[PDB]
Each structure stands twice: as structure tokens, then as C-alpha cells.
Amino acid sequence: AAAAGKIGAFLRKAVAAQSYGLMFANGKLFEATGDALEKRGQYGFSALQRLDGLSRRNLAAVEARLGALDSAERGLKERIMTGAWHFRHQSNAALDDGKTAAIASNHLLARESRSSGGNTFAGDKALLSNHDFVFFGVEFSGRGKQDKPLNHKHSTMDFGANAYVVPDTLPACRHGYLTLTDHFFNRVPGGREAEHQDFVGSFPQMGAETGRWIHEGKYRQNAPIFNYRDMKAAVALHLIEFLRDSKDAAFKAYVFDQAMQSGQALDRVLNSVFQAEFHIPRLMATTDYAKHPLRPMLLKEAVDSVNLPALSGLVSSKGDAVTAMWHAIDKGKDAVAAHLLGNWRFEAGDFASAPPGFYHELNYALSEHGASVYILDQFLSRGWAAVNAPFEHVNSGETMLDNAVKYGNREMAAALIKHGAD
């Protein structure tokens, strides 16, 4: 019937309210600015009207401070407010799953449903606590999903070797917020640092100012966020106010020469002035998307992101099987270790010396801070490691139990004193 079309929207809004309630109740920029909320555990719809008000104020703070857009700026505004937007993910994990994508946030991917991967850092859960959002990069070309996207890096970094492109008409995007730059890194990449240097170099004056100019400099860290309704006008207004400040021939010769071809000529104007971000609240599950392999994926990326099929495709001999085993010894990947043990037959002498790129010996690597107890137990039980052998190159004269006690790892210490007198 039709009630199923309304209960779905109600539940979607209810679920999206919790990723905003977490960000607003937690975090501290929102009480250092005046946006914080009260911690509740199960937030209501009050976590969305706050976002709406914030976006309205952020839009006003530029729209009411600009001029009047006499005769030409309205065309530039309309070419942007009526365009087609697609979002690019670029992760190194396995998300296609045949015919349905499913991209989850950190707070869900580590919500007692343990997994592997991630590119988050510290402070992200302290200042903002936006670790419960799915991040995307915007693409203003307007061309369809079945294409080749013309961007690879968001600010300066490649997040993965598989771009997952989705259109902005999905019902899931209705509760996502935009930001003209990285939420945590308010800076804009420099003109020399910006991608597609063949474009910026054509205008040596345009790239001289798009290098440091942060947004909302009242706190040097606060960034303006726009909801779905106000995201299209905000980027156009900020572009216009930037343009009416830059002194270049682009302003008259190219930004009003991109009107008929809003492909590269717009995707290189807007992705050079700004570096936009889209944040979908909790989960991006859909059947309409596109997976484009930008570049081949390395052993390190397949190990870190437990891409088991990709790992099995990359590993073809034993010389790289031992390298992948070392990669799994680091980072504490238990699934990778089990997969490699189930296929290859290793020998105790294979791990007798650290391969190039690894700075620690076998026992120190097995016993260090972020070590894995599964791998340590397997190595001790298969006789590939000596429990009482002392370190020689780092902290000479100490044993693995010294690391276990030193870092306060009760499980590892108990596992260590099961296989040796120590």
C-alpha cells in the first residue's frame, strides 16, 4: 500500500537522527560555538532541525553579505543550482557484493560487528565525533554513472583503487550534509598541490590564491555545513564571492566560457576553487551505483582492508605469500593470517629475517603494542618462534613477556606463559 512508503521515510529519518545526535551531543566544537546538544542515547528529531538551522545561518552569512548578482552572476548560479551531481567513494575494501553496495561508517563497522580497514585518526572523535558518517567526494560533470570519473584524489590523497559512484537522486542522500572542504582539515589544497596541474598552469594567477584560504576563520577550525536543500546554492555563492575577489582573466574569459560545456570546464573550476565533501548519515545501501577500477591494488592495501578475493588474486607464489604474512603480522590481521595459513605451507626458517621495509625482528613484531594474539599463538604452536629467545637489535636482553607486561596485555601474557617456562 502507501503506508509502507511513509513508514520507510519515518524510519530513515529516525536512523539519520542518531548520527547527528552523536555529533552534536558529543564533540566540543559545538559547545565552543553554540551548537552542542544534550546526550540522550536515543536522540529524537531535534538533531535534524539543529542541522537545518545551522545550514540556514551558514547560507545567510554569505548570501546577505554579498552584492546583487547584477546580470552575469545569475547565469553562473543557475548553471550550478540546476546541474547533476554524483558522489565518489574510492575505498580499497570489497563493497560491490554482486548487485548491491553497502558502505558503513566507523561507528557501525566497529559496533561489536568487528571488521578491518579504515582511515580515521585521533581527534576526529573528540572535536567532531563524525566517525558515524559515510564520506564522499562530489563530481559536477553531469555525465552519467557509466563513465570514467575525472578525479582520483580528494585533497591530496588516494583513498582507494575502486571508485563507487552514485547519483545525488538517491533517497539516502536527503539527510547528508555538505562541506566546502575537509571537515577536520579546513584548509584548501594549494594551487601547486591541486590535481590536474595542466589546467591550473594555464591560469598562473588563479592558483595563486586557492592555497590557504580556510572557511569560517572565526575559530580557525569551525567549518560551515550545508544540508541537502542549501548545498547547491552555497557552492555557487562562495564561488562567486571568491571570483569577485580574484584578479585574473579567468573571471571574464573562462568561468563564463564553461556554460555550454559543464563537463571538464566545470569539474575543474569547482574542484579547484573548493574541495567538496558529502557525508551520508549511517549506511549507503543501494542497487544503483557504479564500480570503476582506477588503478591496480597493492598487497599492503589488500591486507589492510581484508580484501580476501583481491588478496588471493595478488598472492600467486610463496615469496609474496611470506610478505603478506609479514604484513598481517603487522596491523594484527587475524583473518588474513588464517587465510594465508589455510593455503600455503610455511617453514620456520621463512620468518628468520625481516624482509625489506620491516624494521623489527620476528619476536618483537609478534610481541609489540598492536600485536595479534591469534598470530602469536599460531606461531608458538607451530614452532616458528622461540618463546624465551631474547631481543638483540632493539631493547637487547629482553623477552616477549617483557613486551606483554610492559604494554599491559593480559591475554598476550597468559598466552605467552602457556608454551614456555619464561
Binding site: 559547545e31 581527534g123 573528540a126 572535536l127 591530496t156 582539515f185 575559530y219 577550525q221 624494521y359 637487547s396
Partner: protein, 222 residues
Amino acid sequence: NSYKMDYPEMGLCIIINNKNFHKSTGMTSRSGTDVDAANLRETFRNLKYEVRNKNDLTREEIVELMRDVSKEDHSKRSSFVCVLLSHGEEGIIFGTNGPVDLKKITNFFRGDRCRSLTGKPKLFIIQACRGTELDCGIACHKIPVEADFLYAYSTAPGYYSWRNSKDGSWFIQSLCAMLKQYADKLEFMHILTRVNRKVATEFESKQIPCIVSMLTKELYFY
């Protein structure tokens, strides 16, 4: 004159890397420091030194280690090098559990408190950092003094960085590059001046290393 660096063995090297601080202090993780430690180990191993790598020592362990090395017999050795990589403040270095003063570290290496090390270079390299993690919205050195001590401070983690994992620090890798390239025809002071020229000048968008020198002669590593 020079420091007569043609002894049988050329000194002793100590590298102390602190990366995983106690949760009580509430300090960051200092990612990408093992690369710095390995770079320093290789750089000073190519210089015929005897490197000793020590990782994550508490406040009371650093003092014990320093007292254990100051009581050795450096009579056949030419110099002594010590490298410290951790957090800190303007005039103090941090262990994993608590801050430890730098003055007390070098008292064991005085001319009168260490007879085997007199008229010999004693190099101390400090890479201290402090993050501005004030989650609401974001100038001196207490220096000891003696006849043959040289200090090289760098209290700066860089003006900014991206989400890419850091490959160390520009100070340390620049120092290693100059040691690899120039430290067979140049004095140490000139090498440090070139390190100053590279860091904080070619790394412009902020601090700059300060070179406190009390050496009474010239240092040629060859």
C-alpha cells in the same frame, strides 16, 4: 685544532624512541617514528658508531640507562652521540610515564663526573614535539653548560599536514641526508647550518631548529 677522531673505535651511539605513552599522561601516538629511528640507525651505523636502539623507556629507565653508559670505559672511543625522539616542552623531554629533566641526563657526562670523556665531543640531538590538541579552537630553553657539549633542538612537528601517513619528520630526514652526503668533507656546524637552511625555509607554508654549541674545537667525522 680538531678533536683527534682517529681512535681505534669511533664512539658510541644511543637512540631512544618513545611512541606509545602511558594513557595517564594523555598523549598522542606519534605515528611514523620507527622510520626515523631506522634512518638514524643506518646513518650513524655508516659512521662506524655502535648504535643502541631503545624503544619506549619510562622516566626512571632513561636515567638508569644514561648512568649505565656514563660509567663505561670510553678510553678507546673518540666521541659520544645521543638521540632523543619523544614529546616534550621548551626545556624538558618526556618519557612514557612522566617528564624527565634534560639537565639531570647530562650531569653524568660532566668533565669531572666522567673522566673517560674529557676533551671529547658529546653530541645531543633532541626532536621534541607538542600538539595543539586544544579541542575548542586554537619560548626558551633551560640549557646546561660545559666545555664539549653540543645540542640540536627541533620543537616543531610541521606547520600543517594532510591525512597521508607521515614519513617521519623533515628535520630528522634532512639531518640524515646531510650526514650521508656532506659528512666526509664538512664540519658538523656547517652541516647543521645546511639543515637549518632546508628545514623551516623550504618547508614554508612555525619554528626553526636552534643550534646551541659549546665545542672548543672543530668536529670532522673522518
